[PDB]
Homo-oligomer: A and B are copies of this chain.
Amino acid sequence: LYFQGHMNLDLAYRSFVLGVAGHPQVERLIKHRAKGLVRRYVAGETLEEALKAAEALEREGVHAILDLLGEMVRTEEEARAFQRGLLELVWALAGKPWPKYISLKLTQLGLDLSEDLALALLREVLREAEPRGVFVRLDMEDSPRVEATLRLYRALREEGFSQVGIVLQSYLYRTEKDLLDLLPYRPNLRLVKGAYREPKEVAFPDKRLIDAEYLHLGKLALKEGLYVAFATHDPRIIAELKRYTEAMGIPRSRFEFQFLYGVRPEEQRRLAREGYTVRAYVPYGRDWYPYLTRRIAERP
């Protein structure tokens, strides 16, 4: 792939990262000599490590979002196996004296195979989560999956569930309209810039416009009285949202900041000491290596 005359840099980087990570020797090397580096960003392979990591965050004033990692689901059986992993997490979280928050992808409950299946399995998760006070975030995947995600979110809201939330991505042209459409749902929103490679036709290609849209949507959601989680590490955006919420007298109980586990941990702590609700998004499970490969292959 070339892009308008010259090599596709984004593709070249991605393909190199992937090619180097997939090399058997590099994978052996990283699992052996880079364990200190990995556990900084990944709790461990088990639910027990993940719960330990959450207790360590809590000790420091920071809350945990637990995100089970799994190889990509391609069969109904694998979606059911993944759901079992999610149920185990919900049950284990049940006792805990702290905020209980999990994140999942609908594709890992078989969305691409059957939307009916995904909804079925998700409702069973929500049935266990809701009475235990476990909050469930539906992570937003790529643009072809947005309509189904909002559809399943609305369906569950309408069946009586409230311990469920959505993620909206500021890089999409469609997001402002999705926000305004969802207003009657009073949704609990995580606002992100967005993680995927999206074409010019559906997403702002300009990083200035992505960041500008983030602030616009964040401010719109706040003025609407929505609870909003600002999931971002951007210090310009964080500083503006702190200035804005303070100037508008938005209570600290109506918004929060969310960081990936291990990313700007001094900031997570600092925001918490300032009275903000801060969460770290904590991946765990046996599929951490492909997962971290992909987060590295996103951008140089």
Residue pair B236, A206 in contact (C-beta under 8 Å): yes
A206–B240 Cα gap in the complex (Å)? 11
Residue pair A236, B215 in contact (C-beta under 8 Å): no
How many copies make up the complex?
A: 2
On chain B, the residues within 8 Å of A6 by CB distance are: none
Residue pair B176, A209 in contact (C-beta under 8 Å): no
A211–B248 Cα gap in the complex (Å)? 20
The answer to whether the Cβ of A208 comes within 8 Å of any Cβ in the partner chain is yes
Selected from B177, B211, B247, the residue in CB contact (under 8 A) with A212 is B211
Q: Give 1 or 0 for each of A210-232: 1 = CB within 8 Å of chain B CB.
A: 01110110011001000000000
Chain A at the B interface: mostly helix, strand, loop or mixed?
A: helix
The answer to whether the Cβ of A84 comes within 8 Å of any Cβ in the partner chain is no
On chain B, the residues within 8 Å of A212 by CB distance are: 208, 211-212, 215-216
A206–B209 Cα gap in the complex (Å)? 15
On chain B, the residues within 8 Å of A286 by CB distance are: none
The answer to whether the Cβ of A291 comes within 8 Å of any Cβ in the partner chain is no
> How close is A262's CB to chain B, nearest CB, in angstroms?
27
On chain B, the residues within 8 Å of A240 by CB distance are: 209
Residue pair B236, A176 in contact (C-beta under 8 Å): no
The answer to whether the Cβ of A243 comes within 8 Å of any Cβ in the partner chain is yes
The answer to whether the Cβ of A173 comes within 8 Å of any Cβ in the partner chain is yes
On chain B, the residues within 8 Å of A215 by CB distance are: 209, 212-213, 216
On chain B, the residues within 8 Å of A208 by CB distance are: 208, 211-212, 236
On chain B, the residues within 8 Å of A248 by CB distance are: 176-177
Residue pair B243, A173 in contact (C-beta under 8 Å): yes
A248–B180 Cα gap in the complex (Å)? 11
Q: Give 1 or 0 for each of A184-225: 1 = CB within 8 Å of chain B CB.
A: 000000000000000000000010110111011001100100
Q: Give 1 or 0 for each of A65-87: 1 = CB within 8 Å of chain B CB.
A: 00000000000000000000000
Within 8 A of B (CB), among A234-277: 236, 240, 243, 247-248
Residue pair A219, B219 in contact (C-beta under 8 Å): no
A208–B237 Cα gap in the complex (Å)? 11
On chain B, the residues within 8 Å of A173 by CB distance are: 243, 247
Task: List the B residue with the shortest CB-CB distance to A212.
Answer: B212
A244–B79 Cα gap in the complex (Å)? 39
On chain B, the residues within 8 Å of A220 by CB distance are: 216, 220
14 further interface pairs, Cβ-Cβ under 8 Å (given A176-B219, A176-B248, A220-B220): A173-B243, A206-B236, A209-B215, A209-B236, A209-B240, A211-B212, A212-B212, A212-B215, A212-B216, A213-B215, A215-B216, A216-B216, A216-B219, A216-B220
18 contacts between A and B (CB under 8 A): A173-B243, A173-B247, A176-B219, A177-B247, A177-B248, A180-B223, A206-B236, A208-B211, A208-B212, A208-B236, A209-B236, A211-B212, A212-B212, A212-B215, A212-B216, A215-B216, A216-B216, A216-B220
